[PDB]
Every structure is written in structure tokens, then in C-alpha cells.
Amino acid sequence: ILGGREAEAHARPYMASVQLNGAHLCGGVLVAEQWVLSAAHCLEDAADGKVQVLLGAHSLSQPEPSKRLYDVLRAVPHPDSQPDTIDHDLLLLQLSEKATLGPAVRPLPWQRVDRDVAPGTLCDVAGWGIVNHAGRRPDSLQHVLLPVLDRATCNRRTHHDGAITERLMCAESNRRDSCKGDSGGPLVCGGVLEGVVTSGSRVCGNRKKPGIYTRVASYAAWIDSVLA
Ligand SMILES: Cn1cc(NC(=O)N2CCC[C@H]2C(=O)Nc2cccc(OC(F)(F)F)c2)c2ccccc21
Numbered sequence: 001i002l003g004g005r006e007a008e009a010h011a012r013p014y015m016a017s018v019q020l021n022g023a024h025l026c027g028g029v030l031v032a033e034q035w036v037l038s039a040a041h042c043l044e045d046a047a048d049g050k051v052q053v054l055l056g057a058h059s060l061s062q063p064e065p066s067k068r069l070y071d072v073l074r075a076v077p078h079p080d081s082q083p084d085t086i087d088h089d090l091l092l093l094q095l096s097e098k099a100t101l102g103p104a105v106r107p108l109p110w111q112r113v114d115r116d117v118a119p120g121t122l123c124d125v126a127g128w129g130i131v132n133h134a135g136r137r138p139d140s141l142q143h144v145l146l147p148v149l150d151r152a153t154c155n156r157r158t159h160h161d162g163a164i165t166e167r168l169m170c171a172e173s174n175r176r177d178s179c180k181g182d183s184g185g186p187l188v189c190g191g192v193l194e195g196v197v198t199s200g201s202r203v204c205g206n207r208k209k210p211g212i213y214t215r216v217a218s219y220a221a222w223i224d225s226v227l228a
Contacts, residue, residue: 017054018052030099039184052070060140071095086198121148124146129142182197183198
């Protein structure tokens with residue numbers, strides 16, 4: 001997260017760190033007792049690496065009573081996701097058992113009504129991604145509040161030049177932004193999950209290249225099918 005602040009520890013009990021061989025790789029969001037949603041590109045060339053999900057965390061490194069590292073029974077990328085596109089960039093991770101719930105670990109309600117978030121709506125995105133251009137990695141969860149950017153602006157040639165489909169949304173990226181390592185994490189608006197940070201390499205903090213988020217409401221039936 002660029003231009004953000006250290007999050008209040010455990011105030012986002014849905015927040016997941018998706019880890020590969022013990023290192024933070026991507027954000028994710030607990031959406032059911034046994035299921036974490038993230039981005040499909042996260043597991044590109046993950047091969048047979050050990051994929052785990054850390055729940056209940058603030059610090060990646062320090063002991064906390066609510067922190068638990070879960071193994072993953074199933075990783076389910078969206079069938080239409082592809083390495084060279086930003087489309088359908090969702091991943092569902094089935095934990096090896098249902099998560100132990102409490103004040104620091106709780107699924108987030110998620111949007112099923114397929115209607116756009118209004119431009120200017122202030123939404124929260126959190127993550128353990130890089131916090132500066134040097135690539136400094138924070139030990140603890142960071143967050144930033146970002147206004148939703150209208151799709152027409154986001155689609156201007158100067159911005160993302162027609163790439164933003166009805167299944168995607170954008171947020172402003174003027175100094176405050178998601179960045180490398182924040183992919184897969186949640187964009188939350190009014191206490192409901194609306195977006196998942198896409199996992200394509202994108203310059204961070206430049207107003208001319210807004211953040212892109214997959215609209216969870218557009219994939220409601222897919223999320224349901226995988227859980228079933
Ligand atoms: C906006 N933005 C999104 C990008 N993509 C992206 O993050 N990923 C693609 C799928 C995997 C994930 C990733 O690279 N994770 C990763 C890798 C190494 C360390 C690490 O820990 C960390 F963050 F440094 F603390 C995290 C991305 C990449 C570059 C620039 C902007 C970028």
C-alpha cells in the first residue's frame with residue numbers, strides 16, 4: 001500500500017495473507033468459514049509450492065493469539081483466467097478445515113447485487129504489499145481509503161484505454177494506491193466486499209493509471225458454484 005497508514009490491529013478480521021513457502025505473496029479475504037478469495041495470477045508459476053493462508057494476523061512475523069496459518073485443501077482459479085489478461089482474475093482457496101472464528105477472524109459479507117459502486121464512494125483496501133518505490137515490505141497490515149473512479153474516466157486512452165469491462169471497477173491512484181503484494185486483497189465499501197485487487201503489474205501511485213479491482217458481484221454465481 002502506498003500513501004497509507006498502519007492498520008488498527010485486527011480491525012479487519014476478514015483480512016488474509018496468502019503465502020507461498022512461508023512468505024507473504026498476495027492479499028485475500030475470508031468470504032466463508034472455509035474459503036478465502038484472492039486473485040488468480042497470485043498462483044501463477046506457484047507450481048507445487050506450499051500455499052497457505054494466514055488469518056487473524058496483524059504482524060507477519062510476531063506471535064499473536066488470533067494468528068493461525070491454515071493449509072489449503074483446494075486452489076480454484078477462475079476457469080476463464082489467463083496469464084496475459086486482467087479478466088476473471090479470481091481465485092478461491094479452500095482451507096483444510098473451517099477457520100476458528102472470533103473477534104479477529106470473521107468472514108466479510110460480499111456483494112451479490114450486480115450494480116456498480118457509485119463514483120466517489122470511499123472504499124478501504126488493506127494489505128502487506130510494498131510501501132515505497134524501493135520495495136520496502138511492511139511487517140504489519142497497512143491500509144488506505146480510496147474513492148471509486150467512474151468507468152468512463154478509467155477507460156480513457158490516457159488511463160486504461162478501454163480495458164475496464166463491466167466486470168471490473170477502478171479506484172483513484174493519486175499518491176494513495178494498492179501496490180505489489182496487495183493483489184488479491186479486498187476493496188471494501190460500506191462494510192461489504194465489492195472488489196478484489198487485480199494482480200497485473202501496474203505502476204503504483206500515479207493518478208493516470210488507476211487501481212483496477214475485479215467486481216465480486218459480477219462473479220456471484222461462480223463463487224457459489226465453487227463452494228458447492
Ligand atoms: C499493483 N501491482 C500488483 C502486482 N502484482 C502482484 O503483486 N502479484 C502478482 C501475483 C503475485 C503478486 C506478487 O508479486 N506478490 C509478491 C511477490 C514478492 C514479494 C511480495 O511481498 C511483498 F509484497 F513484497 F511484501 C509479494 C504488481 C507487481 C509489480 C508492481 C505493481 C504491482
